[PDB]
Scaffold this motif. Sequence first.
Motif, PDB file in Angstrom:
ATOM      1  N   UNK A  29      39.340  54.780  21.695  1.00 41.43           N
ATOM      2  CA  UNK A  29      39.534  54.628  20.257  1.00 41.43           C
ATOM      3  C   UNK A  29      40.093  53.247  19.941  1.00 41.43           C
ATOM      4  N   UNK A  52      44.443  64.947  12.641  1.00 41.92           N
ATOM      5  CA  UNK A  52      45.329  64.635  13.753  1.00 41.92           C
ATOM      6  C   UNK A  52      44.608  63.732  14.744  1.00 41.92           C
ATOM      7  N   UNK A  53      45.245  62.620  15.099  1.00 44.12           N
ATOM      8  CA  UNK A  53      44.633  61.614  15.953  1.00 44.12           C
ATOM      9  C   UNK A  53      45.557  61.276  17.111  1.00 44.12           C
ATOM     10  N   UNK A  54      44.963  61.075  18.285  1.00 45.92           N
ATOM     11  CA  UNK A  54      45.665  60.592  19.465  1.00 45.92           C
ATOM     12  C   UNK A  54      44.996  59.302  19.913  1.00 45.92           C
ATOM     13  N   UNK A  60      44.271  54.283  11.225  1.00 46.34           N
ATOM     14  CA  UNK A  60      44.048  55.676  11.585  1.00 46.34           C
ATOM     15  C   UNK A  60      44.134  56.543  10.338  1.00 46.34           C
ATOM     16  N   UNK A  61      43.251  57.534  10.252  1.00 44.18           N
ATOM     17  CA  UNK A  61      43.204  58.393   9.078  1.00 44.18           C
ATOM     18  C   UNK A  61      44.375  59.370   9.072  1.00 44.18           C
ATOM     19  N   UNK A  81      34.984  58.522  17.909  1.00 41.21           N
ATOM     20  CA  UNK A  81      36.076  57.554  17.923  1.00 41.21           C
ATOM     21  C   UNK A  81      36.632  57.345  16.520  1.00 41.21           C
ATOM     22  N   UNK A  82      35.757  57.056  15.560  1.00 38.75           N
ATOM     23  CA  UNK A  82      36.140  56.972  14.152  1.00 38.75           C
ATOM     24  C   UNK A  82      35.957  58.358  13.550  1.00 38.75           C
ATOM     25  N   UNK A  83      37.040  59.131  13.511  1.00 42.70           N
ATOM     26  CA  UNK A  83      36.967  60.524  13.086  1.00 42.70           C
ATOM     27  C   UNK A  83      36.262  60.641  11.744  1.00 42.70           C
TER      28      UNK A  83
END
Lengths: 202, 56, 85, 164
Positions: free
Chosen positions: A136, A129-131, A124-125, D52-54
């Motif tokens: 995903x 901000x990621x959930x 995850x980057x 999905x892949x930001x």
Amino acid sequence: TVIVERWWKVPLAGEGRKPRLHRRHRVYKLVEDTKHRPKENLELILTQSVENVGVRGDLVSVKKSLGRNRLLPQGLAVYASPENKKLFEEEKLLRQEGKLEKIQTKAGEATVKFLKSCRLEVGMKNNVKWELNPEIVARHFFKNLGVVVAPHTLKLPEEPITRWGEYWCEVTVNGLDTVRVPMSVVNFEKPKTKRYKYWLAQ
Amino acid sequence: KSKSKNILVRMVSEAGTGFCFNTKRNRLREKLTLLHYDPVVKQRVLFVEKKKIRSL
Amino acid sequence: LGQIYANNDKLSKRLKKVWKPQLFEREFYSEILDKKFTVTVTMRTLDLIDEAYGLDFYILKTPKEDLCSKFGMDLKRGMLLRLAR
Amino acid sequence: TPDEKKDEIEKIKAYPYMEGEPEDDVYLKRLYPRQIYEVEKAVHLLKKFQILDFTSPKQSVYLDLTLDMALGKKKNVEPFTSVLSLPYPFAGHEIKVDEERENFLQTKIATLDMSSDQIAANLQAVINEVCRHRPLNLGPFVVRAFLRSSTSEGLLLKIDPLLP
RNA sequence: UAGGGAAUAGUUUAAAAAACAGCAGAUGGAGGUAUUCCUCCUUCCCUAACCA
RNA sequence: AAUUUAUUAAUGCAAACAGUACCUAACAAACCCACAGGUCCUAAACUACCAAACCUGCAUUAAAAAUUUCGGUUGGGGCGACCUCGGAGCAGAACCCAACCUCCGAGCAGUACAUGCUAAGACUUCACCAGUCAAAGCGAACUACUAUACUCAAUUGAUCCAAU
RNA sequence: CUGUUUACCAAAAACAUCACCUCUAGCAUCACCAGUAUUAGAGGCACCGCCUGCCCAGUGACACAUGUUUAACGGCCGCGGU
RNA sequence: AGCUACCUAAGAACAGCUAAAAGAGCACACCCGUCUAUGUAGCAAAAUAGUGGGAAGAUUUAUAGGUAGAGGCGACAAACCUACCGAGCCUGGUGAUAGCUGGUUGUCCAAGAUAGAAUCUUAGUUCAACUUUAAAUUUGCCCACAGAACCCUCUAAAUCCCCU
RNA sequence: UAGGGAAUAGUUUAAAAAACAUCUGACUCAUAUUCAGAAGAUGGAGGUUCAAUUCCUCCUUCCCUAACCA
Ligand SMILES: [K+]
Ligand SMILES: [K+]
Ligand SMILES: [K+]
Ligand SMILES: [K+]
Ligand SMILES: [K+]
Ligand SMILES: [K+]
Ligand SMILES: [Mg+2]
Ligand SMILES: [Mg+2]
Ligand SMILES: [Mg+2]
Ligand SMILES: [Mg+2]
Ligand SMILES: [Mg+2]
Ligand SMILES: [Mg+2]
Ligand SMILES: [Mg+2]
Ligand SMILES: [Mg+2]
Ligand SMILES: [Mg+2]
Ligand SMILES: [Mg+2]
Ligand SMILES: [Mg+2]
Ligand SMILES: [Mg+2]
Ligand SMILES: [Mg+2]
Ligand SMILES: [Mg+2]
Ligand SMILES: [Mg+2]
Ligand SMILES: [Mg+2]
Ligand SMILES: [Mg+2]
Ligand SMILES: [Mg+2]
Ligand SMILES: [Mg+2]
Ligand SMILES: [Mg+2]
Ligand SMILES: [Mg+2]
Ligand SMILES: [Mg+2]
Ligand SMILES: [Mg+2]
Ligand SMILES: [Mg+2]
Ligand SMILES: [Mg+2]
Ligand SMILES: [Mg+2]
Ligand SMILES: [Mg+2]
């Protein structure tokens, strides 16, 4: 098998008489040696589950060496005779509707075995901000482990993940077997950077 | 044997009849076009060299 | 056991020529006799056994003139005697 | 026809491909051939991956085309650059060629935010543009087509309907 | 003889340049839409023939 | 010397026979991010190796062998020379006529492109085979062409078979 | 050198031979050998003494990148003048 | 493989003298067979007489066994393998084949001698020619004039054609 | 007696060229070496071809081979 034909014509003998064979009728020409023919496959019905060939009840076309030297001697397969075809066909009806339980397909067992012994690196980057959600996480199976997972099958820990850490993903393969895979959330590294960083370095 | 001057060629009718005749020509000259009697059409028509049969 | 013309040209020498089958030693299991046999076979024999769906069917179905084996005929008598008794 | 060049053309044709998701819900990619096809769906999917892949909403779609740039006769055609602007120029565009001459052409088509229909139109224009070098019916000019974003894997498009 | 391929300065290469040989120097020849598209002919090579 | 490699040996391929592994050269120019790193200007596609011997089949090269033959003329045979075709002398005048007799040549070339078709009657190298000359007729040419089976001495090769 | 040969026309200068040399082979349960390179086998030459010169282009063998090899088959020069 | 070539198993023989070490010398038995004569249907399908080489050695020799003909064996003489081995013997295929030689059985009469061509053919064949028989129907033979080339030295003897 | 080959400058070779020898010059005290120049040839005879060392023919000289079997 060597197949030969005569150079010289044999005179007709007629009804109820044996051909008159001169010594010249012993001269032969090689028509074909059937060992050099292209090999055909042997159609067998599997009894147990073989790692790559298939699962019980699956009509499989295998190399004659494999079926003859491994499956048939060891009881893993039986001949696809009319009788055997009927016996297994009756079973496949009972499994679909009757008490007999449904069983994984050939691919299903292969995935389960791989899913039993694999760990997912969910890169995850850091910036954004990621959930972590099933969709995903499903993407990372395809990229990292090479497994094509349907989003609905995945069951996440149900605790929102926004921090790098370790969790557990429960994968259900075809609806029968539920596997719990280790989950390692890590800072995302692009493919080129990760391969140069470690694979090349060491 | 070694000496070589002329060649034998097949002259084919341009009338489409398929009638052919063989003639001798110099190897170093150009392909022959001749006016020759064609029995199928029963009159003189143009013939053009197609192939070399042999060396004369 | 036969003859051939060298280079498949009748105007050339006629030579003696023997074609021998490729032999393989394989193990087979008889259901009627519940015993395993190490039999020297050809690839044709393996194909015929596959088309019969087993050694027992091959031995029982194949006539004497096609089996071309005293051992095969003895297996047939053994299987037939167990079925008869 | 050099063996290696012609043999690869035979091999790339051999690569299997399939229509529709397999019955299994979860299946290893290796166990089944390539599947995703339709050009419309492909663009929609590439947008899905972006979420999905930001990554940037606008990205260069670097369509790579395995176009049979050879085997017109037993003598093979040569690499040129037929330049034509696409119906919607992304924010003439050169059809560059491979250095290894393995027949794959890396040619950007559209920004990711471009609408599927516009990207689909941009695709069709290139199909005619690329065949311009050898637009003969003697030798098939197209084998495979991979529509890839910058940060996504290539997808095998069903280009056969759009070829002519 | 059959097809396949090839022909650049005297020679051997390149995409109309260099190198050797002796400032000269070339796109084997012909025809057509130009070494670079095609066609016929010459020379040579390759491969297979050269039986009766 | 011609023919052959069945046989023996080697090598290649097929046949037969188990599985071991699946592939890495960034780099921020700008911006983000406490890090570690990320966004943009590509992060695609893509499997390789691979079972030693024995045996069997098909090839290739060797070894060692096999089968068969070794022309004629000729002042004996050998050596030399010669072996088919035409002209001249021997053979003076119808035909024919020999010598390892006396002389000279031939194994093409050139011009046509109706050197198209057909058909009485004849010639003939002493047999046969082959070879040669032709009226009329058809179709052409033609009312300028010693025009009509071309000039030319020989200038050549049967059957089978092969190519088409 | 002793020896050997054409029993029945040749007993020899022919063959063998001690010696010398070339070639091949790293190995066991029927020859070689119940042996193992100071060995075994295939050949040449012919004790000893002095010696055995030059040549690998050709053929053969060996070796492979050229190549190596004659105690392998074999070979080992002219014409004109002083 | 009872001869002979070589080999295997286990046996046998070798006086006297010299030297005393001997593939050493002299010399019996014994093995061999140099030279001469005799013999030549012989005593003998290889001998006799004398004279010779060797004779403790790579010697000679009795016995049983082994290697077999596309082979064996050979101190290579193309030796030897049952009196005759350039490859044994026997039987069979076999009445091998022979353009080559020899042979071909009662009486009587009749007609009957011959250009050449081709041929691995010239010691032979086939076709012509000649010869024989039977049959058909019509000229055959002998020949008068007239007639058959110039070029070139023998202006030849003649021929061809030909009615009567 | 039979058969094959050869003949090129004075000499020896080549496919009308080189090498020396020969003559001319320069360098040396002079000679040689060297350097720069110069000339010179298709055994004989006949014929083909526009043109023949290079296509044929006879002769001369020379070389090599064979000249055997009873
Ligand atoms: K005489
Ligand atoms: K003697
Ligand atoms: K050599
Ligand atoms: K014996
Ligand atoms: K006689
Ligand atoms: K004869
Ligand atoms: Mg002959
Ligand atoms: Mg003669
Ligand atoms: Mg004579
Ligand atoms: Mg002669
Ligand atoms: Mg006649
Ligand atoms: Mg007329
Ligand atoms: Mg004697
Ligand atoms: Mg003797
Ligand atoms: Mg004697
Ligand atoms: Mg000697
Ligand atoms: Mg010596
Ligand atoms: Mg020497
Ligand atoms: Mg003097
Ligand atoms: Mg004996
Ligand atoms: Mg012994
Ligand atoms: Mg004594
Ligand atoms: Mg002694
Ligand atoms: Mg003595
Ligand atoms: Mg002896
Ligand atoms: Mg001798
Ligand atoms: Mg002799
Ligand atoms: Mg005898
Ligand atoms: Mg007879
Ligand atoms: Mg009379
Ligand atoms: Mg003949
Ligand atoms: Mg005669
Ligand atoms: Mg008369």
